[PDB]
């Protein structure tokens, strides 16, 4: 999908669910920010 926008990091939780972390805003979400964009 190209690179993540600046500040974002992809992580996996303890159950293995992928999520996305914005280190600027300190917001986490399930949705890939590149799918929004």
């Amino acid at each position: 999908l190209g690179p993540l926008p600046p500040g974002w990091e992809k992580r996996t939780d303890s159950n293995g669910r992928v999520y996305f972390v914005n280190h600027n805003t300190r917001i986490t979400q399930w949705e890939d920010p590149r799918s929004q964009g």
Binding site: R11, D13, Y19, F20, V21, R26, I27, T28, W30
Partner: peptide
Amino acid sequence: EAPPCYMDVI
């Protein structure tokens, strides 16, 4: 339900 909040992330 929701992903882990930021303070749990770090």
